[PDB]
A and B are shown apart, each in its own frame.
Chain A
Amino acid sequence: IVGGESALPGAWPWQVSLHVQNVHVCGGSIITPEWIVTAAHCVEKPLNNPWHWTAFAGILRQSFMFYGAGYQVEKVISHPNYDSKTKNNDIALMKLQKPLTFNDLVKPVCLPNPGMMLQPEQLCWISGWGATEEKGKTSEVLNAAKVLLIETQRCNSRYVYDNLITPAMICAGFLQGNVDSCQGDSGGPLVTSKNNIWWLIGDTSWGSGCAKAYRPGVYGNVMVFTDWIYRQMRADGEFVEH
């Protein structure tokens, strides 16, 4: 997170660090005790198998994510219509073997409901352990930044992303740059407050550079993916019911 600030305990209780080979690779958003919303580019082959992935919740610092605090991922579900190249439908779901114990440090984000009537430039928040500067390294402390939604019509301008923002994609940040998501915030929460409830509006998908002018952050539209999320969670509940 470029342009942001060190996150406080419980500020983003949904934010999860997803690890492969004992290092942070992607962020995630706890939506249920066992389900995590992340990006589909995060779990592209060879990381499509759940065994590589361990989830760390309620820990703000990457160095405090020790052996024994991780939650092993049991199931990785990439969006069926995810395109590696356009990164359209860049949403994935990670189930955890061990359900997460919800507290004030670990808590779910609300899945967006139809009819949120969000503002064209809705103040949203982006959290993650990603780079604090472009081409930079994974951050130690969980960072977060206020970002405003950029209407897709404005984000699809030739001077911004030139028709590369699909309906399964939402733009957030600032057209001046300075404050954006970056390497390692992938799959992380683009969340807004409404009705004193935080809503997962997007998962960190892509963007050209980090915090560059006219190059904002592009997030997978979780609203468009809610049906797929509900279907995948219900199917898992039905399958393990047996």
Chain B
Amino acid sequence: NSGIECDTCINPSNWCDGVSHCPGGEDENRCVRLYGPNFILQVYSSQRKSWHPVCQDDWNENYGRAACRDMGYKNNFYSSQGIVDDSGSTSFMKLNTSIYKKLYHSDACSSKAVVSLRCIACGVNLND
């Protein structure tokens, strides 16, 4: 309750920084998240201490499969398309082709779209 807890407390700049600092690795295993009813792909920024939408720029399905792998869905992958961001976000995570830690902070997305990653075909019943 001064920084980020591991259930050990961590400085939020060491949360999601690529180096596993909690003994249970809690600081490095929950760094990718889907946001909102549109599955806006988000990555936690250690520097900005915030969750940020991944830009659709140069994002392919293997990066989604990897984010899906990093979220516990393993080889489950359903959809990764670009969508307008409804997460109310101002900073975004763009890919430096040269999951998390493979992105960098940008305030725009050249595609104008964020990644909507659907790791599993779920949430559908008999009635649309």
Chain A residues close to B by CB (< 8 Å): 8-14, 31-33, 80-81, 102, 104, 107-111, 113-117, 194-199, 227, 229-237
Contacts and interface: CB of A to CB of B under 8 A. Distances in A.
Interface in B65-80: 69-74, 76
B13 interface: no
Nearest to A118: B37
B87 interface: yes
Interface of B: 7, 26, 29-30, 33-40, 42, 51, 69-74, 76, 87, 120-128
Q: With a 10 A CB-CB cut-off, give which of B36, B40, B73, B120 has the most chain A CB atoms.
A: B120
The 8 closest A-B pairs by CB, nearest first: A233-B72, A110-B123, A195-B37, A197-B123, A234-B72, A108-B122, A10-B126, A110-B122
A231 B37 contact: no
Contacts of B127: 11
A115 B38 CA distance: 10
Given A230-B71, A233-B72, A197 B30 contact: no
Contact of A107 (B7, B73, B87, B124): B124
A109 B128 CA distance: 14
23 contacts: A9-B126, A10-B126, A11-B127, A33-B76, A81-B7, A107-B121, A108-B122, A108-B123, A109-B123, A110-B120, A113-B34, A113-B37, A116-B36, A116-B37, A196-B124, A196-B128, A197-B37, A198-B123, A232-B72, A233-B71, A233-B74, A234-B72, A237-B72
A23 to B, nearest CB: 27
Contacts of A233: 71-74
Nearest to A199: B123
Given A198-B123, A233-B73, 4 more contacts: A33-B76, A114-B35, A114-B42, A231-B72
A232 B73 CA distance: 10
A14 to B, nearest CB: 8
B16 to A, nearest CB: 12
A10 B69 CA distance: 28
Given A32-B76, A102-B121, A234-B29, A115 B71 contact: no
A231 B29 contact: yes
A228 B43 CA distance: 17
B97 to A, nearest CB: 25
A11 B126 CA distance: 6
Nearest to A110: B123
Contacts of A237: 69, 72, 74
Contacts of A197: 37, 122-124
Given A107-B124, A231-B29, A115 B87 contact: yes
Contacts of A230: 29-30, 71-72
Contacts of B120: 31-32, 108, 110
B122 A114 contact: no
A234 B122 contact: no
B37 A10 contact: no
A227 to B, nearest CB: 5
